[PDB]
Amino acid sequence: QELFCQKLQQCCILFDFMDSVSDLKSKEIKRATLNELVEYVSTNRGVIVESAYSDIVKMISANIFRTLPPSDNPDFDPEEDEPTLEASWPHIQLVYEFFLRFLESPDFQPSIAKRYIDQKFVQQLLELFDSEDPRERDFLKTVLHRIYGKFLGLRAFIRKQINNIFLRFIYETEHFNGVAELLEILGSIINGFALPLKAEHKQFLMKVLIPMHTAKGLALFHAQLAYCVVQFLEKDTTLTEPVIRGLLKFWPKTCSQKEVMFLGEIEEILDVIEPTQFKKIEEPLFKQISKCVSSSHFQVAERALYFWNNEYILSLIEENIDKILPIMFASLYKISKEHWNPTIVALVYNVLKTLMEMNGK
Amino acid sequence: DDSLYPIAVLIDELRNEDVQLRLNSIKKLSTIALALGVERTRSELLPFLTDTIYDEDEVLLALAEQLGTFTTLVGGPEYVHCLLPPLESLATVEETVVRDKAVESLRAISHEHSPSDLEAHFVPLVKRLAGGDWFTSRTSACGLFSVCYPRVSSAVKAELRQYFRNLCSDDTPMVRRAAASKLGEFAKVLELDNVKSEIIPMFSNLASDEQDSVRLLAVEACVNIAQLLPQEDLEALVMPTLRQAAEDKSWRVRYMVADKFTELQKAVGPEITKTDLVPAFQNLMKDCEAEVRAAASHKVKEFCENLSADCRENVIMSQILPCIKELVSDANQHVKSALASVIMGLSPILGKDNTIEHLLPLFLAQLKDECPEVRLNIISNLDCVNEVIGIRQLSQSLLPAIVELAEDAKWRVRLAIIEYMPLLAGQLGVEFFDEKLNSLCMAWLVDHVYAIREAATSNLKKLVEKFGKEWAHATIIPKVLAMSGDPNYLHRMTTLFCINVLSEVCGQDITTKHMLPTVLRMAGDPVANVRFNVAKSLQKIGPILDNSTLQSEVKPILEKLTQDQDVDVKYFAQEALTVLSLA
Amino acid sequence: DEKVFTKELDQWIEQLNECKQLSESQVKSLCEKAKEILTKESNVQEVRCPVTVCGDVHGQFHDLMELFRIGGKSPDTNYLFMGDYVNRGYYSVETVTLLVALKVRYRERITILRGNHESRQITQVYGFYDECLRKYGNANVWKYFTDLFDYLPLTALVDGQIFCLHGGLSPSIDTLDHIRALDRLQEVPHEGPMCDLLWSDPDDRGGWGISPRGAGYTFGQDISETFNHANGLTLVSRAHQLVMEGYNWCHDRNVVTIFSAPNYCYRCGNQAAIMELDDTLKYSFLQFDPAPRYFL
């Protein structure tokens, strides 16, 4: 008898009051109903049955599934961070929390929910990742992590959708703003690799993650991408040379702001490579770093010179003396030019002294 | 070798470590290829260049465009097949620009391939590109079906159709988008029977795709299929597709349809138009989105202009005008800005008896809106009402509004009113504007901004020739000479410019009678600016004067100004003397 | 052989008015001649009464064209610009090129003063170096422009009554002679009288304060009054600081801030303004709105 009220009370919240249009006690009633239902389902376990799944999933679909209206983006810099298009956040927050708590229920039944959760549902849920505000993107990322941890049978479809989204974001257009919230969850879930590296798994890295370094807005998600990339090296050290070669051949020589980030990612990656595997890229990497340091730009030069502050980097450098040959000319030429910046001059002088500490020419 | 040696370009001059040198080499390789000989070239250079090139965008695009341009240096129309493996291997790259350029070069050289060579190499090439595992090859393969389908055997095209169908049914969105985009180019197959048999179901399934990009591309390419004019079948083949696409939720498709409404109506036909598009347009203009309504308001003029002349008045009065009230009164700014620059074009179609009663109030309401750009767009094309409504009837209503708004805060509105005045002033009469619109011209001439002063000078020089020299020597000469007694040099330069801008039209008489003394007196201004602007103007007024007054008075003044302490005025005086030929 | 070069500079100005950059060698020669011209100017460049004072531009070429439309073309009407033309602008290169070309052509007519943004470090960090690299592929043009900036005057004095400068007053500067004694031929330091002159801004508080920007000092009404009374000045004109109205009076009309970059970075939406000084130094303001319109 009480099981019918759980599905009869949903009819009231069946329709939407619309945040844009002025409302009355109706919106307050909807908010109160949701605020009560969240606590009810959080404190009362076991009331959900096979029939409630259909009603709740239908309500969630009718509530959240909707593409954003035409959004204005005059400036490309995200320093503004003004979610003007989103105004119903306090309302959708309740249904988001409801869905998150329902997924986090220990007695969840993925088999029963699979009757309604299908590829079209995953598509309608992923299209919302384009939300202008991050308050929605982070919650969508959390819901995606939860549904991936619960529904493991759809991992292939999720991976295919992510690959398609990344391919579209790379070539067609850079309008997708929820790329960071996907890259971070990807780098976090990749840590779960406990089996031998599959061919497709290792090919996706080189075919999707690497080519994504050429994006314009890389500064928005460079740390997450670098983390996801280095996560693959700690699992298999044999795939480091192709990754480093791809990063080298995709060097952004037209933007020093991206060059600094590339140098940072490189420094973060060399702490895993071994000397036997490092020798395969020693010569080209150092020949490129020579020109990078020769650049007449202060932050890139100081970031390339900081490499002499890591123990592992110092060890990999002192392993042989055949690597300072291309750097000696750059160090001797860097002191003559760029006199307006004595800091980089002193830095390169200290680096030359450190290189001279070891017997070399 | 008169040019770069062969072995050098082969191994020594292709050191792939330098990118710029190798790019220049691949760019200038034509000078060496034309000398190496077509035979040895097609024998050794193509496989060597295909095997040595690794993967760099610059040299890749260079080789692509070179092969595209080498269609003549190959030496034989039958040997062009040797240029197909390289372009095919280049099209399989992940980058989109280089593969697009390769597909372009391929479709360009396909017109030169012989029938035998074509059926022998181009068909297997596209079959291999469409069957590739990666999506880049599948996207690049759909670009060669439009050129290889018609000029091949009648038996192989039946298989090319199925190959294109399979390629369009890919499991990735990139291939589907490319197919939806290039179907408009591939839809030209002549065989209407096979079209109606096998293509229209594919088009219907494409218009119902889950992706919105595919839907908008399909409804865009729909024009290429509707251009066949199958009016006897559109009501059942394509009409339901356009109907179900009109009420679209992805909104992008609605905007795409709005941007293609005119091109669609151009081929849908008059009866189908009046039956379906007019309700569809009325429903689209009342949509909640802003872009669709803006496009509809911008294209309403072109839609009404291309409407059948049988009974346009009834339908437009019954459907459009009762609904445009909501758009003109809408709170959106871009919609009104786009509607203002097009609504005035409907004045002649509504007829003189109904236009001055229906569009006049809405026109006046839009002219007095708070949006400056709206008023600017309105006054920009205001020269379309005088040819439809009488001058007196137009002055009874709109002349007060325009002469009142002529002093708006935005200077661009004043400039538009100024540049539009000449026609209305000439159509009203010489006495009307001289007795009523004199204060407005005076306020224009005294503006602190230089653009409005130049516009007023141009209007004056245009009206003086439209009314003669009498009004010139009577009214404007003293009013312009009086402004020269102002303290601001920016106002003195105004008269200094207007003097010669009017002398270049009046002639020598009024010039040497009134303007010459003023310009030779202003030369004594203590401010350097005035006393070299005087030379700048003398450089232009010179030829107007005669040879007598020149040596009489203009020569000593210039010779004295040449000795001025400032170097700029000295150079200007020297240039004026040189142009004057006063040797 | 000066007439051919005058014609070349005239057609350079014409091309630059069309929003077209010059070549590397042309920019090098133009910067060399601009240095040769500016080396003769003092730290306190003397300007005469008829002139138009303008604020920051920041590479907004179309807004500079609108400014010229409002105030007039550079040849006839005189201009006194208070710096800032680099970074934070899509067309910074064309702006600086046109400005230096007008200066070389009409050194008497137009005047230019250095700004804090005209500094190697600031231009590199804020993206003018990036624009130069994109438009020329190397750093030669950037090097030439940064070397020329070292010769730009720091302050100007029109009619011996109105003191014009980019930043503001400095606690180590009491008289104009102290400014005339400074050595401008050097990169903008991180502190000192030059950095203060190029970074300082007015303040509602009393006395001297620390600039929130990390460089320069903040001064109140009393400081400006003392400086004006000790130097016999009538008004201190400055820019640097953004204002919603384009121009703003402060410190009992002892200091005026002018800003000529309307809709700064397409987000501020602030209006622009210019200050005209007629024959007898009487001032007037003119406000205007913005001009309407892979890795390799």
Ligand SMILES: O=S(=O)(N[C@@H]1CCC[C@H](N2c3ccccc3Oc3ccccc32)[C@H]1O)c1ccc(OC(F)(F)F)cc1
């Ligand atoms: O993402 S990319 O940076 N391409 C970029 C990404 C999209 C924009 C660029 N574009 C472009 C793409 C599509 C339409 C128009 C375009 O107007 C251009 C005009 C002038 C240069 C380039 C482009 C395109 O060129 C990349 C490069 C190489 C890769 O590896 C390789 F070589 F393919 F194997 C992977 C990715």
Ligand SMILES: [Mn+2]
């Ligand atoms: Mn500043």
Ligand SMILES: [Mn+2]
């Ligand atoms: Mn500034």
